[PDB]
């Protein structure tokens, strides 16, 4: 079994027990998140592709925690024009652990 899910404006292909990082969510650590907008479920020969979505499919995951990625440096410089500026960045994320996939 593997499934296709939507989260954070992007799509993921997941299997049971996978740990993945998605865009920051408002759920608390230790909570359960349920996806009911599954796009595709595959079990060997059994294939289900949703027209927009698969009716009745579910993917359940647990929230592990939140964090920030590694720092990125932004540099801008216009040569011969006396211009230069800099800034740093660290993007937020949420970590999920897939606990159940049902078609």
């Amino acid at each position: 079994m593997y499934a296709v899910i939507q989260s954070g404006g992007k799509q993921h292909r997941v299997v049971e027990g996978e740990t993945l990082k998605v865009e920051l969510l408002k759920a608390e650590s230790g909570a359960t998140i349920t996806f009911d907008d599954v796009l595709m479920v595959v079990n060997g020969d059994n294939i289900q592709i949703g027209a927009p979505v698969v009716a009745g499919a579910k993917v359940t995951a647990e929230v592990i925690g939140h964090g920030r990625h590694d720092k990125i440096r932004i540099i801008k410089m216009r040569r011969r024009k006396h211009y230069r500026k800099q800034q740093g960045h660290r993007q937020w994320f949420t970590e999920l652990k897939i606990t159940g996939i049902s078609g």
Partner: protein, 117 residues
Amino acid sequence: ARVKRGVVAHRRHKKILARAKGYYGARSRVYRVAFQAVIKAGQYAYRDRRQKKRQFRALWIARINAGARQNGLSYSRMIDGLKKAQVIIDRRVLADIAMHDAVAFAALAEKAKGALA
């Protein structure tokens, strides 16, 4: 109040040289050359954070084209057929399935050509 510059100046130069680790020749030893090298690296990184998305989309499209032509369709016809069939799976997942699961991709192509018909 006379101020000496040594400690702060040494700290700034040492930070620049530390960021210049790994470059060839004077680019990792000499402060002037190293300082010019770090700024150019930053500019390149800024540009390539935009170029990366285009490069990966091109890779996905090529793999989807190969899978479609294995199943008897072209890339453009397969994309149009999926759009007509209302499937909204994106190219990244489509290319992953094309690489790692031939049967599922064959099912997707069957759906697309059935919608095209």
